């Protein structure tokens, strides 16, 4: 569940951002079906 600690990527339908470490990411809380 890692990630590129850059800026913006899309976790399924939700938009995300990665912290200084690539471990955690802050995302919007919408429901996907894709």
């Amino acid at each position: 569940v890692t990630c590129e600690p850059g800026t913006t990527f899309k976790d399924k339908c939700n938009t995300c951002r990665c912290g200084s470490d690539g471990k955690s990411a802050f995302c919007t809380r919408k429901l996907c079906y894709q």
């Binding site: 899309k10 938009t15 200084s20 802050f26 995302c27 919007t28 809380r29 919408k30 429901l31 079906y33």
Partner: protein, 251 residues
């Protein structure tokens, strides 16, 4: 809704469901005035391409491609309290930022105004700001602990955190937390909103007014109910001016 309690039938009449013509839900909403629903802006657009972090008409979800449900309790099963409604227009905030999450609030014009009853009726817009530690209630049909879905509406009662001590928490992870945002949750984590909760309201009871006010809507958070990481919501008093401008709603 992580570690939540089942909502009691009729204690949250303002709650609105945003679901595809399909029936399947994807966001929460709260009834304002006679024919308006407030939500998170990001609910109302298909995921913008990172190569061009700007917004377009073509990116925004179309009014014909979703419906609003009011007076719903069961997540999938139907009621005679349910009212299925069309969408005339949708209006995002002019300074809404899809990447920063700033001004994450948007309004949806109803096509026909719902019949107001004990199970369907609006929430008040906030007539002023919120104190540190105010007990709020958050509601949604989102994914809970262990990643399953509820049969019912679920709610959590949580304290609001002060903006300063919220910012200090989301640095130095280098994520911006603007004034238009507000945080709710406890230090050691445990109660939070989650996937499928966006737009779902965060309310307070006022006394000695005896009225429920809308404080903010579900916006974003790290994971769900993580230690030292409070859930972030869209602050509404910050954008009340715009809302009143667009809707024309007085309390």
């Amino acid at each position: 809704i992580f570690n939540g309690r089942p909502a009691q039938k009729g204690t949250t009449p303002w709650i609105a469901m945003l679901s595809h013509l399909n029936g399947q839900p994807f966001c929460g909403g709260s009834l304002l005035g006679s024919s308006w629903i407030v939500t998170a802006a990001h609910c109302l657009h298909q995921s913008l391409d990172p190569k061009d972090p700007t917004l377009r008409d073509s990116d925004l979800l179309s009014p014909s491609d979703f419906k609003i449900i009011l007076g719903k309790h069961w997540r999938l099963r139907s009621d005679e309290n349910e009212q299925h409604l069309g969408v005339k227009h949708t209006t995002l905030h002019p300074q809404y930022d899809p990447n920063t999450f700033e001004n994450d609030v948007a309004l949806v014009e109803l096509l026909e105004s719902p019949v107001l009853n004990a199970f369907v009726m609006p929430i008040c817009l906030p007539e002023g700001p919120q104190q540190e530690g105010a007990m709020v209630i958050v509601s949604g049909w989102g994914k809970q602990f262990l990643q399953r879905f509820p049969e019912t509406l679920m709610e959590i009662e949580i304290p609001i955190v002060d903006h300063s001590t919220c910012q200090k928490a989301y640095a130095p992870l280098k994520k911006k937390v603007t004034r238009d945002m507000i945080c709710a949750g406890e230090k050691e984590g445990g109660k939070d909103a989650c996937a499928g909760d966006s737009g779902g309201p965060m309310v307070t009871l006022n006394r000695e007014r005896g009225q429920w006010y809308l404080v903010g809507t579900v916006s974003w958070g790290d994971d769900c109910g993580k230690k030292d990481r409070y859930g972030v919501y869209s602050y509404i008093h910050h954008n009340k001016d715009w809302i009143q401008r667009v809707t024309g709603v007085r309390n």
